[PDB]
Ligand binder design. Structure first.
Ligand SMILES: *[C@@H]1O[C@H](CO[C@@H]2O[C@@H](C)[C@@H](O)[C@@H](O)[C@@H]2O)[C@@H](O[C@@H]2O[C@H](CO)[C@@H](O[C@@H]3O[C@H](CO)[C@@H](O)[C@H](O)[C@@H]3O)[C@H](O)[C@H]2NC(C)=O)[C@H](O)[C@H]1NC(C)=O
Ligand SMILES: *[C@@H]1O[C@H](CO[C@@H]2O[C@@H](C)[C@@H](O)[C@@H](O)[C@@H]2O)[C@@H](O)[C@H](O)[C@H]1NC(C)=O
Ligand SMILES: CC(=O)N[C@@H]1[C@@H](O)[C@H](O)[C@@H](CO)O[C@H]1O
Ligand SMILES: CC(=O)N[C@@H]1[C@@H](O)[C@H](O)[C@@H](CO)O[C@H]1O
Ligand SMILES: *[C@@H]1O[C@H](CO)[C@@H](O)[C@H](O)[C@H]1NC(C)=O
Ligand SMILES: *[C@@H]1O[C@H](CO)[C@@H](O)[C@H](O)[C@H]1NC(C)=O
Ligand SMILES: *[C@@H]1O[C@H](CO)[C@@H](O)[C@H](O)[C@H]1NC(C)=O
Ligand SMILES: *[C@@H]1O[C@H](CO)[C@@H](O)[C@H](O)[C@H]1NC(C)=O
Ligand SMILES: *[C@@H]1O[C@H](CO)[C@@H](O)[C@H](O)[C@H]1NC(C)=O
Ligand SMILES: *[C@@H]1O[C@H](CO)[C@@H](O)[C@H](O)[C@H]1NC(C)=O
Ligand SMILES: *[C@@H]1O[C@H](CO)[C@@H](O)[C@H](O)[C@H]1NC(C)=O
Ligand SMILES: *[C@@H]1O[C@H](CO)[C@@H](O)[C@H](O)[C@H]1NC(C)=O
Ligand SMILES: *[C@@H]1O[C@H](CO)[C@@H](O)[C@H](O)[C@H]1NC(C)=O
Lengths: 146, 766, 104, 766
């Protein structure tokens, strides 16, 4: 398949995911730069440039969203899986082979925070995910490095 | 006498010299005193002892640690003996013989107890030389005197303890208190509430240990209380508490209870109190918050309160309490929609730009549940029901109804009269519940409400006063009877009121033309003693339908059902107003003086017949007053003969009621048949459906009142057609099927008061 | 509560009770009569009789209410067919006498 | 030492003389050797025996047939002892004791076993002189040395057998073969593969005693081939086989297995290599037959290949493989239509005319099932359906869907992927199978197809990749609204695009006039950023209907539904473009300046003043510019007093938008009201509906714009109505009703810039 098809398909999938996030009633107006002192393993805040950090961020988000049973979270997780498998193709286009990043060991506290403050976790996660994806689009036009 | 008080409880026993019956007396080695009193066990054991055997005492140091108390159950005085000489090389199989007595209160001299007064219990020692022994003491002698004497049999050597007397109750060691939990109450104060043992008959003072232990700030605050449950003051966040409580007698001496496993309770960086609130729609609530940031308590002047992390709360509702306690007070709050699987609102407290992830829950339940219900016509059953498919905020609670009604009525004043009797109501497929009351006091005022139990509390809906006799639904009237009046032309409705209720009633009749769909008309009757009514209708005997409903007069109660419709029957009412418009024809030779005249007329139409006229008749009048009547049946054409000069004929209609009144007339007369007054006639087809007829006439002497024009097709011998024309008009329009190709004729006749003269005949259109 | 509406309620309930039973001077004497009728009616557990009895004590309570209306502290005081008949008869007797509205 | 090998396994034991403990020695009477070795059971048996008792040995012959072998299960070493003295008169209850020892592998001298080392197991002696000894031999000691000794007690007489050494492993009796299924090879080599027994751990030499029980040819070849998959070439027709393969231990000595049930398989004079093939549409196969027509065997060059007892296959498909084997290749066969009780093609191979009844089967399947899919607008589920109403070739075959997934897009190389996942699709009332995938992967390659299971095999349809993003069916547009533009005349339709998908979209819009039966016109929008479109229509106050629908611009996808139609509401658009007519019916008198002026105008129609008029206005103008115009309203008649000398009038229509812009006009002039330009006119009533009208003119000194024509009946003063044609015409016709009976006023007026001259008033027709 031509690479331009991949370039447009990435944008289509990103927009689909972000609209799915907007459909959720919880995260209707929370913003994406809100600071919570207990949830610092949620990726976000500081900008991301390199492809490797991008794939790492998506892997962490997949691991974090695995711990919720709602149907919408399941569909969004499937779309994230597809997006990761796609982004590896863009990595391979410029001969910059990437590893299959794993669920980072920095997720030690996750479960604990869950059983303490479940609701909050959910909200923040989804919100920040949406925000992060926006950045991704605005950076995919400038063709960031390997 | 011969008794050493155990002051204090702790004492150490050491045996010193004074082999089958070698007994050595043992004494307590105190700091300043040494008491050696012989027990009442052996009195005849004064036997000579060889000096050499004392060398064995060099290798056997009889040092023992003997203690005991009364347990909290006030049942067993378990006594412990420990061997100080913990020699694992050799283990002695020593047996303990205990003699204990509980003398009663005797006011006649303190006599020394004799042999056999004490009780023998074989005391059990464990593998590791520790001996626990059970002593049954009646509860009535707890404050009395108890005596102890111990005998140790080790390797054939007897060791004798002195006599010990002490009150069991003043040194009771309690059991380790249990039933303890550590939650924050609704006022920012942890409670250490333990189920202190009930078997203890005296108040207990407890030593309670805890502290403020954190990562950096560490301090110990050990305390002593006297209540069975305590409530600490001003709990701070991020400080671990290691609480551990033991008990002892509050008054006088005692022995501390068993130490329990320490309980650790750690609060997080933000503490809320109360953490969960359940409140109905339209009330006012409050909260609290304490914040710690990198081991420093944040001042209350920079704290901001959030709501679902979505919109910031306006500063107007913030209140300051102390250095580090705030207040937020919601005003007139709404219902909380279910956001996904979460059925609650989260309220945060935070400062500056960072907000912790711990939150305070807030539920809101709506309580306006509607109850409203009937009383059936037999005044027995009362049936009602309340919705629960619209209101959300539930699917998380069991529901139940309540009663309260005794005297005659309700709706006087609060309260809900907290005495209540539950009643179970079932479920139906319609989505609304229901349940039945019977037998019911018709004049007793029930007060109903719904009670909602929930995972956090209880809530009550606003009540409702209902009196059954005023909410009755009457049964619909029977024997409804509609009948068209006679000789008048009105509709008569008759009926009979239902037996129940025994109040006054108003009826509402609704009626119209019988048919598939009708635009029925409504009418009201406002009298109890009126039971039949008469109304006017436009037609006469087009079939009709009527239905009736009943209601109580004063506006109370509910409407009834619609009765079974009662249709009328068609039947004639009175005499026809108008007979037929009858015309003559002649089919015979002109030369004859006798003419066979055939009278013809249209069948009458409904409203003229008023319904139906089953018979017609002809009547005659000669110059000699020759009059007679004869039937014609349902035949609309008759014929007879005429020979006399002047003869009038009349056509009448006879039906079920009587003969017609206003009818037309016409006379035959040859002598005046020789008169003509019409000079010219013109006819012209405007089109296939319109023809114009005009005429120019001449005056005469007699009074002319009506003409008649007869036309028929000339190509084919069609039926003769005619229609009435008044003498006043001079022009007329004819509207029926016509084609100009075929040929028609016309014949206009002038008729006077006593016959018809010469006619005017035209054979073609002009 | 206003008293002028009471007598209408009395008439309505007495008419109702006489009608349903057909389907099958001084206040102290009034109350003691009604009370003994309650007892002699309690013995029969038939569905009509029990509900008639249950409708009798509303009449009795209303009678106490109307006694208190006049500031009078009223002191508290083959067989079934004839019993029902005499209940009804005493009932229209009560109706007729309360038509005149006698004193305490 | 003291051991004799068991060679062979068949040996006979005879006891000879050397009464409670009399021991007799027994030896084996071999053909060339007589070995007599004393057993190690009794050593103290050296007791004197009387010579007189030897006569008993005359009547007793101790001839024993002992056979010892290891069972196939390698669990019990079954030994059989038979008494050769078959004397039915006396049955001795002799007891047999078998002393068996299995010494372990010892490398320190071959020591003789001592007393008590031998294990004793009682043998199960039977009534018919057969004793069964069951020795439990562990599998680990099979390769070791087994020592046996036999003791027989018969009537108090003891017979001792010599010690014998044997290895149980070498002497194994196998089991008869199992799973002997007769399946001829695809080359007709008649595979006779039988499953080897699992209890035998070594290959077996199989004595295949296969027979040929034909009508004339009989064969009894006993092949000893050890191969389980037997291959017998040159199969002959009518050759039933009764193979009696039993097997034997190939590696080492053994015994032929016991005879099992015969495997009788009858070849009914017609043999094909497996005719049990399943085929698809367009596939090609080949068959071969051998036929028996009495013992000559029909040669392959004389085959009479038929199906359905007829249609001999031409000698073009024929190929000769062997003398009796011929290829009849079938190419791209069509669907085998069912008939009678047949679901195949009855293939027939025969000779000349005498053709047998046995047939073959040709199974052909129309595997082409076209599967379709569709993705929900919310992009959550994917519904896929398929029909099987064309499977009516070999129905009752089970159908199951299989799907396979790939990470991103599916490749263009066609290949059915080796692995698959089943999916159960539920049956629907429309004859289709429908099933749903949820959740969905949007851009992943779903390759899905249908497997068919038939009693002959399994088959696959060609795969069809589906990408769940290329088959999305978008939602209909929301909030569709259409409105008529003001001051322009266009119709503007506006709509909002759906939420999903997020690619570009095109739009189709259809519009028409409302009604029970609607007319449609279609328009297209390709640009994605437009949300409103304006288009022109002729009608200007019709009730309009507009609908829209979407699709992806790239071409992939489906068309959406049609939204709810958006009706329009008629409202004012522009000011009226043309004013209305007006005319003089003035009833004033000649000498009066203030004359009763009356003006008539017909209400303006729909399609000129833009479909609405509510208020009128009657403009007036004097020589002094008197502009009192007032408001006629809904009224259509007017009267004015004629105050001044020279007057001008004008009628205007005012709608909600505003007042009239273009208008009629008329002027008044007393003086030239006395001029005449017309000197004759002719009125010919050809028919009552149309009347022919002419006039003549004069050289007028002013300019003539048009004519005004009026008509009325004098006799009854009929309605006044008129017409306003120009001056260009000469012989204009009128088209309305007339009657020659009465007499009509005709009124022809010329029109000039200050008014009208003398009326050309006429009374009768010309
Ligand atoms: C729950 O809270 C509401 C909201 O009112 C708030 O709390 C009050 C205690 C006051 O501090 C308010 O300033 C504050 O906004 C309470 O409703 C309030 O009730 C009071 C007393 O009935 C109302 O005051 C009256 O106002 C009318 C004019 O409308 C005057 O004529 C009266 O003389 C009197 O001052 C007040 O208006 C009303 N607040 C609102 C917003 O309508 C409510 O009472 C409280 N619940 C309970 C159980 O106290
Ligand atoms: C079946 O055979 C058809 C034609 O028959 C023979 O096959 C082809 C391959 C050529 O050898 C032709 O000359 C022969 O007559 C083919 O059209 C058809 O494709 C074949 N089926 C398949 C599945 O290959
Ligand atoms: C009937 C016919 O011509 N069938 C042909 C076949 O001969 C050829 O071998 C094949 C090649 O794909 O195409 C098809
Ligand atoms: C193998 C076979 O039968 N093929 C058939 C052929 O015989 C027939 O002529 C054609 C049209 O009907 O359809 C195909
Ligand atoms: C309740 O809802 C109304 C309108 O929906 C809103 O104006 C009001 O602020 C809400 N109540 C609170 C406490 O926010
Ligand atoms: C339901 O409400 C009643 C009301 O008192 C309460 O006693 C009962 O415990 C409740 N049931 C629960 C909470 O399961
Ligand atoms: C009125 O009619 C309906 C329908 O027949 C019935 O269900 C209902 O019970 C009736 N009402 C009463 C009071 O019987
Ligand atoms: C017949 O009826 C007409 C109309 O009412 C009346 O004028 C006339 O007198 C009647 N005839 C007789 C004989 O009375
Ligand atoms: C014939 O003319 C008259 C004249 O008004 C009209 O009413 C009628 O409809 C016409 N008939 C036909 C069939 O056109
Ligand atoms: C059809 O046959 C295949 C091949 O073994 C098998 O996997 C599948 O389960 C069968 N389908 C059935 C039994 O429905
Ligand atoms: C389109 O209309 C049909 C007919 O009502 C309906 O069944 C279908 O669900 C509609 N499409 C969508 C996407 O709702
Ligand atoms: C009436 O209007 C027409 C149209 O322009 C114009 O030509 C004419 O002069 C007007 N009449 C008067 C009297 O102004
Ligand atoms: C009346 O005559 C004219 C001309 O002779 C003709 O065109 C017209 O059709 C006639 N009328 C009818 C109704 O035919």
């Amino acid at each position: 398949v031509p690479i331009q098809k991949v370039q447009d398909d990435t944008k289509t999938l990103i927009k689909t995911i972000v609209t799915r996030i907007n459909d959720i009633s919880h995260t209707q107006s929370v913003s994406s730069k809100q600071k919570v002192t207990g949830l610092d393993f949620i990726p976000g805040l500081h900008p991301i440039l390199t492809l490797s950090k991008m794939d790492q961020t998506l892997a962490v988000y997949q691991q974090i969203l695995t711990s919720m049973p709602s149907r919408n979270v399941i569909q969004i997780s499937n779309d994230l899986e597809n997006l990761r498998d796609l982004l590896h193709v863009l990595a391979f286009s410029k001969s910059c082979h990437l590893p299959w990043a794993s669920g980072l060991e920095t997720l030690d506290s996750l479960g604990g925070v869950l059983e303490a403050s479940g609701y909050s976790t959910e909200v923040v996660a989804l919100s920040r995910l949406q925000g992060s994806l926006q950045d991704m689009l605005w950076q995919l036009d400038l063709s960031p490095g390997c | 006498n011969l008794s050493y008080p155990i002051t204090p409880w702790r004492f150490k026993l050491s045996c010193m010299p004074p082999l089958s019956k070698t007994t050595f007396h043992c004494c307590f080695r105190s700091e300043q005193d040494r008491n050696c009193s012989l027990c009442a066990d052996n009195i005849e054991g004064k036997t000579f002892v060889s000096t050499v055997n004392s060398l064995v005492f060099q290798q056997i140091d009889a040092n023992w640690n003997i203690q005991c108390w009364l347990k909290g159950d006030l049942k067993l005085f378990i006594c412990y003996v420990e061997s100080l000489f913990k020699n694992l090389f050799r283990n002695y199989n020593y047996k303990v013989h205990l003699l204990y007595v509980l003398p009663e209160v005797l006011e006649d001299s303190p006599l020394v107890p004799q042999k056999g007064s004490f009780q023998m219990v074989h005391c059990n020692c464990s593998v590791h030389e520790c001996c626990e022994c059970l002593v049954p003491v009646p509860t009535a002698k707890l404050n009395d005197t108890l005596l102890m004497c111990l005998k140790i049999t080790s390797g054939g050597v007897i060791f004798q303890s002195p006599l010990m007397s002490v009150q069991p109750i003043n040194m009771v060691k309690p059991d380790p208190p249990l039933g303890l939990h550590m939650e924050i109450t609704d006022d920012g104060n942890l409670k250490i509430s333990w189920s202190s043992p009930p078997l203890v008959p005296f108040p207990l003072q407890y030593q309670v240990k805890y502290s403020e232990n954190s990562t950096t700030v560490i301090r110990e605050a050990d305390k002593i209380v006297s209540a069975t449950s305590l409530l600490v003051d001003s709990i701070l966040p991020g400080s671990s508490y290691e609480v551990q409580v033991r008990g002892k007698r509050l008054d006088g001496p005692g022995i501390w209870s068993d130490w329990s496993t320490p309980r650790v309770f750690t609060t997080q960086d933000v503490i809320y109190f109360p953490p969960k609130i359940l409140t109905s729609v339209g009330s006012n609530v409050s909260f609290h918050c304490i914040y710690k940031k990198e081991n420093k308590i944040v001042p209350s002047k920079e704290i901001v309160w959030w709501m679902n992390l979505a919109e910031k709360i306006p500063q107007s509702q913030y209140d300051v309490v102390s250095d580090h306690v705030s207040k937020v007070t919601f005003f007139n709050l709404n219902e909380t929609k279910p956001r996904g699987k979460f059925t609650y609102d989260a309220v945060y407290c935070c400062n500056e730009h960072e907000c912790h992830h711990r939150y305070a829950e807030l539920y809101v339940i709506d309580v306006n549940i509607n109850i409203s219900c009937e009383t059936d016509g037999y005044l027995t059953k009362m049936t009602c029901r309340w919705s629960t498919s619209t209101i959300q905020s539930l699917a998380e609670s069991t529901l139940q109804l309540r009663y309260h009604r005794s005297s005659l009525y309700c709706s006087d004043i609060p309260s809900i009269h907290p005495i209540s009797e539950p009643k179970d109501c079932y479920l139906q497929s319609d989505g609304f519940y229901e349940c039945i009351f019977q037998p019911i006091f018709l004049l007793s005022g029930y007060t109903m409400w719904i009670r909602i139990n929930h995972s956090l509390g209880s809530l009550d809906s606003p009540p409702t006063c209902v009196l059954p006799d005023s909410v009755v639904k009457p049964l619909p009237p029977s024997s409804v009877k509609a009948e068209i009046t006679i000789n008048i032309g009105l509709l008569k409705i008759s009926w009979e009121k239902p037996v129940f209720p025994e109040n006054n009633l108003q009826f509402q009749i609704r009626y119209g033309l019988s048919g598939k769909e009708v635009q029925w008309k409504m009418y009201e009757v406002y009298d109890a003693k009126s039971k039949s009514v008469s109304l006017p209708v436009p037609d006469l005997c087009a079939v009709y339908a009527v239905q009736v409903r009943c209601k109580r007069l004063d506006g109370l109660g509910y409407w009834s059902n619609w009765s079974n419709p009662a249709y009328t029957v068609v039947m004639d009412i009175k005499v026809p107003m108008r007979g037929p418009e009858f015309w003559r024809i002649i089919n015979g030779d002109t030369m004859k003086k006798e003419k066979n005249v055939t009278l013809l007329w249209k069948p009458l139409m409904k409203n003229d017949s008023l319904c139906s006229v089953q018979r017609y008749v002809i009547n005659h009048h000669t110059s000699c007053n020759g009059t007679w009547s004869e039937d014609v049946g349902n035949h609309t054409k008759f014929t007879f003969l005429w020979t006399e000069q002047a003869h009038t004929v009349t056509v009448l209609a006879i039906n079920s009621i009587g003969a017609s009144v206003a009818n037309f007339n016409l006379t035959f007369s040859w002598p005046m048949s020789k008169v003509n007054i019409v000079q010219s006639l013109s006819a012209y087809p405007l089109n296939s459906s319109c023809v114009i007829v005009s005429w120019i006439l001449s005056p005469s002497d007699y009074k002319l009142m009506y003409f008649i024009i007869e036309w028929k097709n000339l190509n084919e011998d069609g039926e003769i057609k005619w229609l009435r024309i008044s003498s006043s008009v001079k022009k007329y329009y004819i509207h029926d099927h016509f084609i100009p190709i075929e040929k028609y004729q016309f014949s206009l006749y002038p008729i006077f008061m006593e016959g018809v003269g010469k006619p005017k005949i035209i054979n073609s259109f002009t």
